[PDB]
Scaffold this active site. Structure first.
Site, short mmCIF file in Angstrom:
data_model
loop_
_atom_site.label_atom_id
_atom_site.label_comp_id
_atom_site.label_asym_id
_atom_site.label_seq_id
_atom_site.Cartn_x
_atom_site.Cartn_y
_atom_site.Cartn_z
N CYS A 86 31.45 46.68 -19.83
CA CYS A 86 32.27 45.47 -19.76
C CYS A 86 31.97 44.57 -20.97
O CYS A 86 32.28 44.96 -22.09
CB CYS A 86 32.07 44.76 -18.42
SG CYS A 86 33.00 43.29 -18.13
N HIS A 126 35.14 45.87 -22.10
CA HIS A 126 36.27 45.26 -21.44
C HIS A 126 37.28 44.87 -22.52
O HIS A 126 36.88 44.40 -23.60
CB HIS A 126 35.88 44.00 -20.69
CG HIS A 126 36.92 43.55 -19.72
ND1 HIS A 126 38.01 42.78 -20.09
CD2 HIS A 126 37.08 43.83 -18.41
CE1 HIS A 126 38.78 42.59 -19.04
NE2 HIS A 126 38.25 43.21 -18.01
#
Ligand SMILES: [Cl-]
Ligand SMILES: [Cl-]
Lengths: 187, 187
Positions: free
Chosen positions: B105, B125
């Site tokens: 992420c 992400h």
């Protein structure tokens, strides 16, 4: 007013099945209370993740009603939920007021223990099917998520996102569920 | 001997990205230490789940080396990891000894902060791409999981299972990863 969710957290709960719905429901703007079955103290989950509940169930149950009551799985967690008189009372009250009950993995076996939602189509973890189907009080499904009216069930850690998003859709609608889904990087 | 994993847990970590890898690695028989960046005290994650670490990072870093160092995401968690001199030392040591580093992420942006694995193909992400790519020190990927040698990255909460299973495969092999995957109810 914002919707409210009660997540009942027992020793041996599957931590993924606890945290994913809590987190996703909070992303949806739902006020979530993680309530410890045993009290206020930290809870040792099935894979030894230790989670500090927001409140004891004893306290949280006095702050009802809730728009959803959520039962995580984990074999031992679900057994603890199944043995609890407090859980029985909460689920019966939720059922009586026509409120959503959501359970995942072994979680739905607590519905059986407390005689909740008989005659519903349900799913469970494959390994919890036999326990759930003892007596033939439900009809079994292999869908990742099953919703039969106010009984919402799901299969395992890997279906936790779909389970949580189904709760969001049931409470806050399809558009909110889609909005919450996109940043999760799913599908 | 069993493989060992260090998961560094900072305030504002994404709790799903913390718990999924911890749980899945433990299912794989890896000895996982959840180490609190700030010390031994409980950690308030991004969506307010509170996790009690197994040890402080101060203590856990003295019990190395580890077969993998895992960095969860969460924007604020990753910023805390990026600002930490202790994390810098741990990652540099892990890189120097040719050990696996796994980040998800916003987590990979801590690799940038600490100048780790430059020249690798990485993913993050979508919203963390610009931060990660500042200076062009990595090559960007949109794969759910990217592994370039000893740098293993992934995109978001929804790719956490694939991320965790990739770590398991890297440490314990494809067959163990497949064995651990099946009961999760994935794919
Ligand atoms: Cl279990
Ligand atoms: Cl975040």
């Amino acid at each position: 007013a914002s919707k409210r969710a009660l997540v009942i957290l027992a020793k041996g709960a599957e931590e993924m099945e606890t945290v994913i719905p809590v987190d996703v429901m909070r992303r949806a703007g739902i006020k979530v209370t993680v309530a410890g079955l045993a009290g206020k103290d930290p809870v040792q989950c099935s894979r030894d993740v230790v989670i500090c509940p927001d409140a004891s169930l004893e306290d949280a149950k006095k702050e009802g009603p809730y728009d959803v009551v959520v039962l995580p799985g984990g074999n031992l967690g679900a057994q603890n939920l199944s043995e609890s008189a407090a859980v029985k009372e909460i689920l019966k009250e939720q059922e009586n007021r026509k409120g959503l009950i959501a359970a995942i993995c072994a979680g739905p076996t607590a519905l059986l223990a407390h005689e909740i939602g008989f005659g519903s189509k349900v799913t469970t973890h494959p390994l919890a099917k036999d326990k759930m189907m003892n007596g033939g009080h439900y009809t079994y499904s292999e869908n990742e998520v099953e919703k039969d009216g106010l009984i919402l069930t799901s299969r395992g850690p890997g279906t936790s996102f779909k389970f949580a998003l189904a709760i969001v859709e049931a409470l806050n609608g399809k558009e909110v569920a889609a909005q919450v889904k996109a940043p999760l990087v799913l599908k």
